[PDB]
Amino acid sequence: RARVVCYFSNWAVYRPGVGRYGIEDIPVDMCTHIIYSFIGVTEDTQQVLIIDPELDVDKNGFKNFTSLRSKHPGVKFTVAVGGWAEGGSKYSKMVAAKSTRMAFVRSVVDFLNKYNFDGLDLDWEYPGAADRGGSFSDKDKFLYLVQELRRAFIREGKGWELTAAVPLANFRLMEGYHVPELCQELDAIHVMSYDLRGNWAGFADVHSPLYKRPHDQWAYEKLNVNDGLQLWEDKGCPTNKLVVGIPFYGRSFTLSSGNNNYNLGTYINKEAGGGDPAPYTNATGFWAYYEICTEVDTADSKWTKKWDEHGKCPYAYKGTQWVGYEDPRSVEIKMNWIKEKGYLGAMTWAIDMDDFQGLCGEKNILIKLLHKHMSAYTVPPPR
Ligand SMILES: CC(=O)N[C@@H]1[C@@H](O)[C@H](O[C@@H]2O[C@H](CO)[C@@H](O[C@@H]3O[C@H](CO)[C@@H](O)[C@H](O)[C@H]3NC(C)=O)[C@H](O)[C@H]2NC(C)=O)[C@@H](CO)O[C@H]1O
Ligand SMILES: CC(=O)N[C@@H]1[C@@H](O)[C@H](O[C@@H]2O[C@H](CO)[C@@H](O)[C@H](O)[C@H]2NC(C)=O)[C@@H](CO)O[C@H]1O
Ligand SMILES: *[C@@H]1O[C@H](CO)[C@@H](O)[C@H](O)[C@H]1NC(C)=O
Ligand SMILES: *[C@@H]1O[C@H](CO)[C@@H](O)[C@H](O)[C@H]1NC(C)=O
């Protein structure tokens, strides 16, 4: 009764060559809940914004995805609104008044009926975040939105789920999330236990450390997966509502000129923006898991792979390039820890970045780990 929650990116179909990943590539039986990402909100009318209508509607992307339930009827197929690229300011605007929230709620209900989704995942990053167009009143008003969506979903009578993707840093929780009240209204809390470190921080480090390292200080002291989940519990969220995110990607850095120290915490060339783009994701500062294993794990690789003994994550480097990520060893450790803590399950950002082609070895190696552990695990009663 554990969840394996799989975010599916609708833009992965445009990746070239073996990176192309579409609806037909989703390994549906490895997940219990699959989430089509993303739709957005309009700036002016607070309605659902379809972000790639040629794919999502004209080529039947939404419906191809939800009709997967014909062959896989025990799986839930929902849609996520928001995501990083959507920004936060349209959401802070939409929740500012009862009337604009109600316009959005009606639009959501029509959309979910039209494309036969099982519910909605809220991915506003983030209520209350001044750097993302937010402000103080978002914390109350985001809770109101959640309460109003839940009531609308109850009225529709189809048993739709409502979930949310959330951060784990204390300051973000204080600015945006009434934890006990949100955890009561939501079916699952998808914790984004990743991007905890990255180029923006100004030093090289793994981005999903499980436990504190000696160099973690001040704001970073508790910014690790174990302490972040413990924070959600301490703030009032039941253990059996918390789903732990696992990144299928690494955060990369370009090290400072002449820097031969590759240890965690080493200085970087921050203006570079991160490591150089890899060929399929083509984004400075991150690599898909399959982009990492095809470079790091080959027989003649010139990459050097190391292990963070405290954070329990791999990192690898070559030249000026350094990347921290998750591999089968680190994912196995986190699966065992999820079971030890009694959490509701595991989530991945995102299923289209697993080695789904088997370029390095077993196809879908990381999601198979999530599925192996979660499917044999019984979630205990709240602690
Ligand atoms: C649940 C959750 O993890 N949510 C967040 C994710 O949004 C975020 O991943 C990033 O998502 C954005 C989209 O919101 C990606 O930007 C996209 O970039 C490509 C080209 O580089 C572009 O073609 C797309 O148009 C654009 N998206 C859209 C909506 O069209 C970004 O690359 C993702 N970053 C990754 C995968 O590392 C994840 C991980 O950061 O965490 C939350 O912030
Ligand atoms: C903490 C900080 O300096 N904030 C900015 C970051 O939000 C941002 O990247 C993002 O890191 C967040 C953690 O703070 C993640 O939650 C978020 O998923 C991630 N963004 C994505 C999806 O790529 C960086 C810019 O990339 O700027 C920082 O200043
Ligand atoms: C939906 O499935 C149809 C029939 O297989 C296919 O032609 C189309 O490309 C699919 N669209 C998407 C977005 O996957
Ligand atoms: C890679 O991304 C950059 C930055 O957006 C873009 O300008 C360039 O066209 C992209 N290249 C490919 C092959 O998509």
Numbering used by the authors: 24 to 406
Report text from the authors:
The glycosyl hydrolase family 18 (GH18) chitinases (EC 3.2.1.14) are enzymes that hydrolyze chitin, a β-1,4-linked N-­acetylglucosamine (GlcNAc) linear polymer, into chito­oligosaccharides. Among the eight groups of insect chitinases, group I chitinases have been enzymatically well characterized and have been shown to function in a chitin-degradation process that is closely associated with insect moulting. Our previous work reported on the group I insect chitinase OfChtI (previously called OfCht5) from Ostrinia furnacalis, a species of moth that is the most destructive insect affecting corn production. OfChtI is highly active in the hydrolysis of chitooligosaccharides, colloidal chitin and α-chitin, and exhibits kinetic properties that differ from those of bacterial and plant chitinases.
To obtain an enzyme–substrate complex, wild-type OfChtI-CAD was first crystallized and then incubated with (GlcNAc)6 for various time intervals. We ultimately obtained a crystal structure at a resolution of 1.77 Å. The overall structure of OfChtI-CAD complexed with (GlcNAc)2/3 is very similar to the unliganded enzyme, with an r.m.s. deviation for all matching atoms of 0.13 Å. The crystal structure of wild-type OfChtI-CAD complexed with (GlcNAc)2/3 indicates that (GlcNAc)3 binds at subsites −1, −2 and −3, and the reducing sugar at subsite −1 sits in an energetically unfavoured ‘boat’ conformation. According to the deduced mechanism, this ‘boat’ conformation of the −1 sugar is likely to be a state that occurs just before the completion of catalysis, in which the product has left and the catalysis-associated Asp146 residue is still interacting with the −1 sugar. The O1 of the −1 sugar, which is the scissile glycosidic O atom, is within a distance of 2.5 Å of the catalytic O atom of the γ-carboxyl side chain of the catalytic proton donor Glu148. The C2-acetamido group of the −1 sugar is in a conformation that facilitates its O atom being 3.1 Å away from the C1, and this O atom forms a hydrogen bond to Tyr217. The C2-acetamido group of the −1 sugar is also stabilized by the side chains of the catalytic residues Glu148 and Asp146. The pyranose ring of the −3 sugar interacts with the aromatic residue Trp34 via a stacking interaction. Because OfChtI shows activity from the nonreducing ends of substrates, the (GlcNAc)3 with a reducing sugar at subsite −1 suggests that (GlcNAc)3 could be a hydrolysis product of (GlcNAc)6.
